[PDB]
Each structure stands twice: as structure tokens, then as C-alpha cells.
Amino acid sequence: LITHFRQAIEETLPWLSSFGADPAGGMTRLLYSPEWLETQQQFKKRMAASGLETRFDEVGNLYGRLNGTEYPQEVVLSGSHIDTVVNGGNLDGQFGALAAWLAIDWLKTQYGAPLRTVEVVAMAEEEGSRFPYVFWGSKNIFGLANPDDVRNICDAKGNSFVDAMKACGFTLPNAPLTPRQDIKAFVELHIEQGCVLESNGQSIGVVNAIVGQRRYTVTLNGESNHAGTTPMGYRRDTVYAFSRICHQSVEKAKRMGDPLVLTFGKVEPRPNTVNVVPGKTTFTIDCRHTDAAVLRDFTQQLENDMRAICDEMDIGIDIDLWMDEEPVPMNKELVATLTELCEREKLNYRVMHSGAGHDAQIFAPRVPTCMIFIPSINGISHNPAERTNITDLAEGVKTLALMLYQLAWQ
Amino acid sequence: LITHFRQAIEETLPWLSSFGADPAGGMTRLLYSPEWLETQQQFKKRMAASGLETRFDEVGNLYGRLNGTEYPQEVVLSGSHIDTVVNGGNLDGQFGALAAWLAIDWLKTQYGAPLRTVEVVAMAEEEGSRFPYVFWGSKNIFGLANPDDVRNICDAKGNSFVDAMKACGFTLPNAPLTPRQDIKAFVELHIEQGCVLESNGQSIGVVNAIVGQRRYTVTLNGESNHAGTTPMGYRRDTVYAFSRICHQSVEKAKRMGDPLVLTFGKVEPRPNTVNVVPGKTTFTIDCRHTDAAVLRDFTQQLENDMRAICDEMDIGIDIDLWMDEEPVPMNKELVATLTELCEREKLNYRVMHSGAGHDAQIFAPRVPTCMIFIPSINGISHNPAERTNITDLAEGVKTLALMLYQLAWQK
Numbered sequence: 001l002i003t004h005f006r007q008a009i010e011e012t013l014p015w016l017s018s019f020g021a022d023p024a025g026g027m028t029r030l031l032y033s034p035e036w037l038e039t040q041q042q043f044k045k046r047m048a049a050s051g052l053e054t055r056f057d058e059v060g061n062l063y064g065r066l067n068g069t070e071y072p073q074e075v076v077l078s079g080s081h082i083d084t085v086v087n088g089g090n091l092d093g094q095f096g097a098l099a100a101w102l103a104i105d106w107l108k109t110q111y112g113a114p115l116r117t118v119e120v121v122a123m124a125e126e127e128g129s130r131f132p133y134v135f136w137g138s139k140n141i142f143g144l145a146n147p148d149d150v151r152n153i154c155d156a157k158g159n160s161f162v163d164a165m166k167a168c169g170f171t172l173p174n175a176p177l178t179p180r181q182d183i184k185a186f187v188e189l190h191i192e193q194g195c196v197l198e199s200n201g202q203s204i205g206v207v208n209a210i211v212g213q214r215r216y217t218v219t220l221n222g223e224s225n226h227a228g229t230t231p232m233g234y235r236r237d238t239v240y241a242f243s244r245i246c247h248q249s250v251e252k253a254k255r256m257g258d259p260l261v262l263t264f265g266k267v268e269p270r271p272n273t274v275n276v277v278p279g280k281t282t283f284t285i286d287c288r289h290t291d292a293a294v295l296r297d298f299t300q301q302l303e304n305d306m307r308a309i310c311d312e313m314d315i316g317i318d319i320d321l322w323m324d325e326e327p328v329p330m331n332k333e334l335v336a337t338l339t340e341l342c343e344r345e346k347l348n349y350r351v352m353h354s355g356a357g358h359d360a361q362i363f364a365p366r367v368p369t370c371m372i373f374i375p376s377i378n379g380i381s382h383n384p385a386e387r388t389n390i391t392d393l394a395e396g397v398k399t400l401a402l403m404l405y406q407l408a409w410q
Numbered sequence: 411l412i413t414h415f416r417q418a419i420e421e422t423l424p425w426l427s428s429f430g431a432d433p434a435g436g437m438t439r440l441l442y443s444p445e446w447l448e449t450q451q452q453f454k455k456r457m458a459a460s461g462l463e464t465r466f467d468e469v470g471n472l473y474g475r476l477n478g479t480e481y482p483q484e485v486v487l488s489g490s491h492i493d494t495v496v497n498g499g500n501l502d503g504q505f506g507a508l509a510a511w512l513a514i515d516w517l518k519t520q521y522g523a524p525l526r527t528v529e530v531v532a533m534a535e536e537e538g539s540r541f542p543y544v545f546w547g548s549k550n551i552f553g554l555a556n557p558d559d560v561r562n563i564c565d566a567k568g569n570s571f572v573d574a575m576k577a578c579g580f581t582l583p584n585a586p587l588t589p590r591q592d593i594k595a596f597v598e599l600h601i602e603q604g605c606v607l608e609s610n611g612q613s614i615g616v617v618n619a620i621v622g623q624r625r626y627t628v629t630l631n632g633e634s635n636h637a638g639t640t641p642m643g644y645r646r647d648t649v650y651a652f653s654r655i656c657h658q659s660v661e662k663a664k665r666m667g668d669p670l671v672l673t674f675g676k677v678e679p680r681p682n683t684v685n686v687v688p689g690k691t692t693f694t695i696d697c698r699h700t701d702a703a704v705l706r707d708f709t710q711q712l713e714n715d716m717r718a719i720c721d722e723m724d725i726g727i728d729i730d731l732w733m734d735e736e737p738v739p740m741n742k743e744l745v746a747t748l749t750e751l752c753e754r755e756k757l758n759y760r761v762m763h764s765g766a767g768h769d770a771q772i773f774a775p776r777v778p779t780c781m782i783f784i785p786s787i788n789g790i791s792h793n794p795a796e797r798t799n800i801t802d803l804a805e806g807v808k809t810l811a812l813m814l815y816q817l818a819w820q821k
């Protein structure tokens with residue numbers, strides 16, 4: 001079965017990738033761009049000619065529908081986002097949507113009409129790579145997006161949001177949409193964007209949950225001084241202070257173990273010169289975990305450690321916690337069905353978590369949802385060097401087709 | 411005496427500071443600029459009217475001479491540099507030259523001509539704040555300059571070193587000058603540019619040595635990864651590696667104790683974003699000490715420590731040592747005389763070292779030399795806000811005058 005989809009991929013993937021191709025390398029889609037519009041239009045046509053009822057909702061999300069026989073109003077959905085970042089992609093997002101179409105087209109030819117309605121979706125924007133807003137697609141599906149937060153009061157480097165939208169043929173609503181209550185289940189296939197599958201030698205990941213997140217901005221204020229005339233004992237060096245904090249905290253994170261992660265990726269000393277003790281340093285913090293209580297307890301302890309260190313050195317501290325989102329588990333029953341399914345099939349799988357956010361995180365709190373991971377080479381993502389071995393890709397489409405059978409044909 | 415020099419300063423300092431005043435703030439008197447020219451011409455005229463024999467040497471160093479009666483060929487010299495940084499203060503450099511003139515003028519009228527000749531000097535440039543070269547003034551006095559190093563390396567912002575020099579009435583030599591060999595001693599009075607004297611409520615500092623210096627640029631190469639999907643055990647975090655290096659090295663430096671200083675003042679991670687493990691970091695190192703062997707051995711140990719940490723983390727490292735200068739001690743006899751003079755006058759002093767370079771380091775290995783420090787409030791320098799209490803400035807001129815009396819009016 002793996003070899004069948006293998007071919008389907010070789011004929012469809014290169015075709016889809018042509019639209020939005022960037023000479024500078026990789027993929028460059030971006031919300032409401034001429035390249036965006038052409039992609040959806042081309043994809044909608046292909047689907048319609050396949051025998052599925054196609055449509056665009058109010059903001060550009062694309063659907064492909066196959067009606068069920070006894071519970072036609074209960075729908076099983078599957079898909080991913082159609083947009084990308086500025087350079088390179090080809091697999092992130094669009095593959096999950098391509099897969100759902102391949103799976104559904106195959107299911108219909110082998111078993112005819114399903115008993116429950118099944119649908120494929122190509123969502124508009126999951127990566128705010130053009131405008132200062134994220135999840136414009138999935139959010140409007142559940143009516144969580146407020147038109148005010150994007151009206152004109154906001155735009156990219158020149159063009160207005162409302163203009164680019166109407167330029168593609170869609171009118172910005174006057175109020176939030178009506179939430180969908182007809183969705184019985186949602187399944188999203190994505191590339192992991194990591195190395196865990198490769199390093200443990202596997203091919204399919206059963207996602208149990210989506211990690212919660214916390215992002216800080218911290219500012220330390222000491223005193224700038226002559227690097228040669230000021231003895232060590234008279235100093236209030238902000239870089240040395242940062243160093244004690246980073247070193248100590250990273251170590252602590254390591255002892256706690258997976259799935260905990262801690263990163264200090266942006267640092268800005270002032271004046272930032274070789275012969276001047278820096279009296280100021282601005283830095284960031286990024287911490288994640290699957291358990292809400294652990295996330296809170298660990299980051300709270302760090303706040304106490306930073307405070308203790310700085311009070312000792314007599315350096316002032318300013319802590320700004322600007323991103324605080326909780327963990328998102330996947331439906332308990334759906335995970336069980338998928339797991340026992342992998343067992344039944346001789347699939348080389350692994351139960352794991354997602355260290356990154358996906359459209360799936362907004363569906364989950366409203367309807368039963370789950371995700372399927374496929375490995376990525378060298379954990380590369382968001383750049384042209386993104387790639388996965390085709391036999392792994394086929395294994396993904398195959399496993400997606402099986403879950404959908406169990407949910408709408410069984 | 412203190413109150414006499416206080417009044418002298420109050421009258422002359424504002425006058426001299428007027429030439430080179432910057433509307434943008436502070437002082438801006440760069441090498442061979444019109445402001446530089448006027449300052450040197452006005453100061454020379456005033457010294458002449460005062461009764462001194464004045465002249466300019468080949469590169470613009472200005473002198474004020476008073477000939478001695480017994481050993482006319484022997485010269486006791488005192489002064490400092492007249493140039494400044496872009497928006498600096500009105501004490502760094504020029505005060506030292508001002509004080510020498512004021513001291514000699516008082517000594518002259520109180521005791522008459524000296525046994526040996528005495529000279530005031532206002533050197534061309536010590537900051538290198540305009541052109542890419544430093545010590546163009548003091549280096550030429552001892553024939554260490556060499557014109558080929560500035561003949562082409564001329565560039566303020568399209569301004570030629572040779573042209574600005576000619577614009578001021580000076581022509582660069584065809585070869586290194588003939589070193590002076592008549593200087594019996596050199597004494598430089600200068601602000602501390604630090605906070606040691608102020609913190610201890612003292613007013614005079616007897617310097618015994620000038621520190622040596624080392625500066626590096628180090629690059630670390632690891633790997634950039636996704637901050638969420640990449641487990642801790644699979645990372646090559648260059649910011650984590652830097653912090654480990656900075657933290658433990660500073661620790662070792664503090665244990666060593668004064669006069670050792672160590673600083674990591676510049677850090678540049680890439681890509682420098684909140685959700686991306688940084689795969690590259692470039693940073694700097696500044697280290698100084700008064701003992702040549704310790705300076706060399708401590709930084710070499712640091713070099714080995716960095717390599718260990720990086721090899722253990724599988725991170726590539728490049729170490730670039732671009733500045734490496736030796737420390738210079740001040741003449742033992744002169745230091746003794748100055749120390750003894752301070753006790754005798756019940757002065758509130760302290761013996762300390764200089765954590766910064768000065769023209770004095772260029773004179774020391776060739777002729778007996780020493781320095782006198784005064785306090786710097788809040789240790790501020792090279793900034794429009796550098797200041798020093800006026801009675802402390804007065805104290806400095808007085809100490810400088812008593813020292814010159816010992817060296818030239820006594821046999």
C-alpha cells in the first residue's frame with residue numbers, strides 16, 4: 001500500500017509546489033498574495049474535477065466535500081495551512097492538505113460513499129509572515145477572530161490588510177463569523193519540524209499533546225565604567241550577571257529532563273564595546289513543557305533565582321512576561337484509536353509531544369482532535385533545506401487514510 | 411599656596427577651554443584641526459608674554475623653556491597632551507599642560523632662575539581620535555614614529571593626514587626624527603579617570619606603574635535549532651557556552667585580586683531571536699595587569715579553559731588576539747622622592763597604579779619618569795561631564811611645583 005501513494009505524491013507534490021515558487025530559493029506564499037490566490041484556485045479546480053463539492057468560506061479557507069449516507073450532517077475534517085514563510089517550505093503546511101485529498105480520493109474509489117461526511121481543508125494562514133496576526137484561518141472557523149484587530153489599523157510593509165483581501169475577492173466581515181458546530185473530529189498530518197523521530201529511528205509519531213509556552217523580556221541595569229581603571233570589586237557588570245543566570249538555569253533545566261526546554265536566544269548589552277563595563281543588558285527567555293504545573297513551578301523558581309542574584313550584586317531587575325499560553329492535550333479517545341491502529345498495522349511508531357504550535361491547538365479545545373507526525377531530515381524547517389524521505393511521506397498518507405476509514409466508514 | 415593656585419586656575423582654565431568648545435557639547439579638539447591650531451597658538455603667545463622661550467618642533471609639539479644657570483644642557487620636563495576625544499571634557503590632557511606652566515611661573519618668581527633648565531610641553535596627539543594612529547606626539551620626540559605609517563593612512567572623512575598637517579604649517583619628515591637625548595626627567599600630572607581616590611576621600615595619587623593590555627575577539631560556531639522541537643541533549647547552544655566561559659573566568663579573575671581586571675563588554679549572537687537556539691556568537695575580551703609574566707600566563711590559562719569547554723560541547727572556536735602591549739614601571743628613585751615629599755607635607759595620598767595608557771609610557775623606558783593623579787568624580791572621563799573639585803586641582807598643581815623644585819632648583 002505504501003508504494004501506491006508513493007507515486008501519487010510524485011505526480012502531485014511537484015505540481016502544487018510550482019505555484020508560489022521563489023527563484024531566490026524555496027517557497028514564498030504569504031497571505032492574500034497573487035501567488036496565494038493562484039494556489040487556492042488551482043487546487044480548488046483539481047479537487048472539483050475529482051468529484052468533490054468545493055467551496056471557499058468568507059475569508060478564503062478552501063474545502064472539498066464528500067457526503068455521507070446516514071449521518072450527513074456529522075463531518076470528519078482533515079487538512080493543514082496553505083501559506084508559508086519567506087524562504088523555503090514545500091512541505092510545512094501544504095503537505096497535510098495534499099495528503100487529506102489523496103486519502104479521500106482513494107477511499108472513495110475503494111469503498112464508495114462513506115456513512116459520515118468527510119472533508120478536506122486548505123486553511124488560509126497559520127504563519128503571520130506578512131501581517132501582524134496569527135491563525136487568521138482556523139480562528140475564523142470557530143468565530144474567534146475579531147475584524148477590528150486587522151481593519152487597516154494594520155498592514156505589512158506598505159499594503160493594507162483589507163486591500164490585499166479584497167484584491168483576492170474577499171470582503172472583511174463587519175463582525176465575527178458564526179462558529180461551526182457540525183465537526184465531529186479533526187485530524188492533522190504535519191512534519192514534526194524536529195529530530196526525535198530520526199534519532200530514535202522511526203517513521204510515525206502519535207502526538208499526545210501540544211506544549212504550553214512562556215516568553216519573557218528581562219532588563220538589567222547596573223553601571224557603565226572604564227574597563228581598566230575600575231577595580232573588580234567596584235563593578236556592577238550586567239553581562240557577568242546575565243552569565244550567572246543563563247549558566248545556572250540551563251543546568252537546572254537539564255536535570256529536570258525531557259520534555260522541558262529552556263533557551264536564551266537574544267542578548268543586547270549597552271554600550272557593547274570592548275573597553276567598557278556594560279551598565280545595561282536586555283535579554284529574552286523561552287520555556288516550554290507538557291504540564292501546566294511544572295511550567296509554572298519551574299519558571300517561578302527562575303524568577304526567584306534572577307531576583308536573588310541581582311539583589312546580591314546590587315543590580316536592578318525588570319521582568320516582563322509577555323507570552324503565557326497553557327498546554328493543549330489531544331482527545332484521549334482519538335489517541336487510543338490511533339495508537340491501537342498503529343499496533344494492528346506493524347507501523348514503526350512512537351508516542352510523542354509537539355514542541356511547536358499548529359492550527360490543531362485551536363481546534364482541540366472545541367472538538368475532538370489529534371495529530372500525526374512524519375519525520376524531518378536534520379530537524380530542518382522554515383527554509384529551503386526542508387525535506388523528508390518519500391517512503392516516510394507515503395507511510396503518512398497511508399496512516400491518515402486508515403484513521404479516516406475508522407472514523408467515517410466503520 | 412593652595413588658595414593661590416586655586417585663583418590662578420579659576421582665571422586660566424575657562425580661557426583655554428574656550429578654544430575647541432563644541433556646540434554639540436563638551437570639547438572637540440582633534441589633531442591638526444583649526445581648533446587645534448588656535449589653541450596651540452594662543453597658549454604659546456601667553457607663555458611668551460610670561461617670559462618663557464617658546465617654539466614648535468617638527469610635528470607640532472609646543473614647548474615653553476626656562477634656562478638654568480649651572481646645568482643648562484640638562485632638562486626637567488613636564489606636561490601632557492592637548493587633543494581630546496569627540497565630545498570629551500576639559501580636564502583630560504590639557505590640565506596637565508596648564509599646571510606645568512602655572513607651577514614653573516610661580517617657582518620662577520619665588521626663587522628666581524633654576525639650577526637646571528625646566529620645560530613645559532603640550533603634545534600634538536595622544537587620543538588618535540581623528541586618524542588611525544596613536545601617540546604621534548610623544549613617539550616623534552624619541553624618533554619612534556616613521557612617516558611611512560601615516561603618509562597614506564590619511565583619513566578623517568576624506569581628509570588627508572598630510573594636508574591637514576600642511577594646513578597647520580607643518581611638513582612631515584622624509585624619515586624618523588633624531589631622538590632628544592637631553593631630558594633628565596619627565597613628570598606628568600593627569601586625572602585618575604577612575605573612582606579609587608574619590609571613594610577613599612583622598613586627593614593625591616603616587617603612581618608606581620602603568621598596566622599592560624590584551625584584547626581579543628573570539629568566535630563560537632555551533633548550530634541553530636528550533637527552540638521548541640529540539641530536545642536539550644541534542645543542542646550546540648553558543649550563548650550557553652559563552653555564559654559558561656564568562657562566568658568561570660570572571661570568577662578566577664576576582665580570586666587573583668587587584669590589580670588584575672577582566673571584562674567581556676561586547677556580545678553578538680546570531681540570529682539573536684527569542685525562539686531560536688543561537689548557532690553563532692562573537693564576543694570580546696579585555697585584560698590588564700602590571701606584571702608582564704602574570705598577564706601572559708593568566709590569559710593563556712583562559713585560552714586553554716575556553717578550548718576545553720568548546721571541545722566538550724563539540725563547538726568550533728577561533729581566538730584572535732589583536733592587541734598585546736607590555737606594562738611599564740615608573741622610575742624607582744623619582745617615585746621615592748615624590749612619596750617622601752607627600753608625607754613631609756601631611757598630604758592625603760595613596761600609592762596606586764594606572765589602569766590606562768598615557769604619554770608617560772612612551773617616555774619611561776628611555777628617561778626617568780613618573781606621574782601624579784588627582785581624583786575623578788564618579789570616575790567619568792571622555793565625556794562632557796568629567797569634573798574634579800577645584801581645591802583638588804589646586805592640590806595637584808602644588809604637589810607638581812614642589813616636585814619640580816626638588817629636581818631643578820636643588821643640586
Ligand SMILES: NC(=O)NC(NC(N)=O)C(=O)[O-]
Nearest residue numbers: 225226227228275276791792
Ligand atoms: N581604552 C580603555 O581601556 N578605556 C576606554 N574606556 C572608557 N573610557 O570607558 C577609553 O579609552 O576611554
Ligand SMILES: [Zn+2]
Nearest residue numbers: 092093127382
Ligand atoms: Zn511553519
Ligand SMILES: [Zn+2]
Nearest residue numbers: 081092093126
Ligand atoms: Zn506548519
Ligand SMILES: [Zn+2]
Nearest residue numbers: 502503537792
Ligand atoms: Zn583621554
Ligand SMILES: [Zn+2]
Nearest residue numbers: 491502503536
Ligand atoms: Zn589623557
